[PDB]
């Protein structure tokens, strides 16, 4: 018999001492080197609860990567609080390496294995390890990139109290390629989507959707307002942060239009942090060709609550609250004190 | 010690657009999400729509959204709130209303502003 | 769009007696229900949510409770600040509101 318990937890990697990226740095010397071979003990016959919107492993996460990016990233100008900061603003190489969470002694990670488990309930195929998988943290909008696949169907994770949902995360199963290029105006970019593999998987996501509120139709539309950071694809890519225009991707006619889609994107100086404290303003972007090519694995959406409801259901790509990122990947996931 | 201060009602001539604002104080500003209310004459409460502070998304009431705007400026913990097209049933004493959430869900509210009686005649 | 059905519209009541309010939800609303009390010239304050959980500074006269579409506030010694008007709120499916209970004098 064990009860659950939140505890503190170090993290593990394979960071390299001798690079100049600065996960590698921020892990060589908070993190320990990763364990050989991980051990996993299957546990006959347990059922237990699991619940992904109460799991404190996702706040410990969201401290570590708070950390990361206060000790690495280099705003010129930074505008938190009420003053302003300016120190110097080198630009920096940057490209998240995973994360690994673990325990110490007494206490044990369960791990769900069930394939179709969607986030919040029993679980009956249960095992414990040491330490989690390797975890890139990845702060994005709207899409989660180079996460982890869910292994059979997509699933549709929602904290369902209430109908009131702040967001829904999309686990695909299938991941589908981004490719983002600005070429050698410097802040002009735009991302490449093979739309034929994307609007195949979209109408699955749908058939999913559908499924999950009550067969009723399926509708798309774009973010109804807010911040950049939400109302487009958001990410960073080589210490630069991207903006990209999704209308195109989440096309209504061309699900239920092959080729490749481009979307618009635009490097921009000055952000809203996502740590939630303020704005911070960084040099322009490097010369040469930037390029990231990124794994699509998931979607953050929130459905429209107040419309007439009878027959359609409207979702509009989401994000912005960075625990989600963390929670898609750690929902499997829950701590427990062994006595 | 939680205060949603609100500004800006009056008469509104008949078509105007009205705004009104809320500035909030005495919480993380970031942790709740804001919704607003109105109570018509002789009518119940009726929610317009809400927004999340952290990044400004709004969701509106569908028979209002298109002459609805909600809005904030985060530097100063102020939510706005515009009504367009402004018509005599939009006479109202108007409420922002702090939400209570968990960390996938909305559910109750549990602080009122101190509201902004609109009237609309020209 | 669900609809939240308070009854009475008028309740009569004395002062120091047990005084019972309800709203009928059109369809269910699992436990998602709060109630109000909205003095003359003041805000809207919480009195109960989650059905049956009073909340922080309410005193102890208030308590609330549901069963299946139904859900009651009581007020067991009305004082003399009790006697106005109190509503019910859904927040199962968007937020929806009663139109209110007024609490007066009887005679």
């Known amino acids: 018999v064990w009860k659950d318990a939140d505890t503190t937890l170090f993290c593990a990697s394979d960071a390299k001492a001798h690079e100049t990226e600065v996960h590698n740095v921020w892990a060589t010397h908070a993190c320990v080197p990763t364990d050989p071979n991980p051990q996993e003990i299957h546990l006959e016959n347990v059922t237990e609860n699991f619940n992904m919107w109460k799991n404190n492993m996702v706040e410990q996460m969201q401290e570590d990567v708070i950390s990361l990016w206060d000790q690495s990233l280099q705003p010129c100008v930074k505008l938190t609080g009420g003053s302003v900061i300016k120190q110097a603003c080198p630009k920096i190489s940057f490209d998240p390496i995973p994360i690994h969470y673990c325990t110490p002694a007494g206490y044990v990670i369960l791990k769900c294995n069930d394939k179709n488990f969607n986030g919040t309930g029993p679980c009956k195929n249960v095992s414990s390890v040491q330490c989690t998988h390797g975890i890139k943290p990845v702060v994005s909008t709207q899409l989660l990139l180079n996460g982890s696949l869910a292994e059979e169907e997509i699933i549709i994770r929602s904290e369902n109290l209430t109908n009131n949902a702040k967001t829904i995360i999309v686990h695909l199963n299938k991941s589908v390629e981004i490719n983002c290029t600005r070429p050698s105006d410097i802040r002009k970019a735009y991302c490449e989507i093979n739309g034929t593999k994307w609007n195949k998987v979209l109408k699955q996501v749908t058939e999913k959707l559908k499924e999950h509120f009550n067969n009723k139709t399926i509708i798309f539309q774009p973010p109804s307002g807010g911040d950049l950071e939400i109302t487009m694809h958001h990410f960073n890519c080589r210490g630069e942060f991207f903006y990209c225009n999704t209308t195109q991707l989440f096309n209504n006619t061309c699900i239920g239009c092959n080729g490749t889609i481009t979307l618009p994107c635009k490097i921009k100086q000055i952000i809203n942090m996502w740590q939630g404290t303020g704005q911070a303003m960084y040099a322009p972007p490097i010369d040469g060709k930037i390029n990231c090519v990124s794994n699509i694995t998931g979607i953050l959406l929130t459905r429209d609550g107040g419309a007439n409801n009878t027959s359609n259901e409207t979702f509009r790509p989401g994000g912005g609250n960075i625990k989600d990122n963390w929670r898609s990947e750690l929902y499997k996931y829950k701590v427990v004190q062994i006595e | 010690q939680v205060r949603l201060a609100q500004y800006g009602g009056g008469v509104k001539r008949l078509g105007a657009t009205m705004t009104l604002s809320c500035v909030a104080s005495?919480?993380?500003?970031?942790?709740?999400?804001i919704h607003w209310v109105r109570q018509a004459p002789g009518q119940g409460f009726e929610l317009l729509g809400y927004?999340?502070?952290?990044?400004?998304?709004?969701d509106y009431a569908g028979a209002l959204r298109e002459r609805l705007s909600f809005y904030r400026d985060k530097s100063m913990e102020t939510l706005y709130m515009d009504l367009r097209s402004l018509r005599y049933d939009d006479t109202a004493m108007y409420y922002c209303?702090?939400?209570?959430?968990?960390?996938?869900?909305?559910?109750?509210?549990?602080?009122w502003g101190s509201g902004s009686p609109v009237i609309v005649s020209s | 769009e669900i609809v939240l059905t308070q009854s009475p519209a008028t309740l009569s009541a004395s002062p120091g007696e047990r005084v019972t309010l309800t709203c009928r939800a059109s369809?269910?609303?699992?436990?998602?229900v709060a109630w109000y009390q909205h003095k003359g010239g003041q805000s809207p304050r919480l009195l109960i949510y989650?059905?049956?959980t009073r909340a922080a500074g309410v005193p102890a006269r208030f308590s609330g409770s549901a069963s299946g579409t139904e859900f009651t506030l009581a007020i067991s010694n009305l004082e003399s600040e009790d006697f106005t008007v109190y509503f019910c709120?859904?927040?199962?499916?968007?937020?929806?509101f009663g139109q209110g209970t007024r609490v007066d004098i009887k005679r």
């Open positions: 209303v702090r939400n209570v959430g968990t960390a996938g869900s909305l559910l109750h509210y549990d602080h």
């Open positions: 005495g919480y993380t500003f970031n942790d709740y999400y």
């Open positions: 927004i999340d502070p952290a990044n400004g998304r709004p």
């Open positions: 369809r269910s609303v699992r436990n998602n």
């Open positions: 989650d059905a049956s």
């Open positions: 709120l859904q927040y199962n499916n968007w937020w929806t």
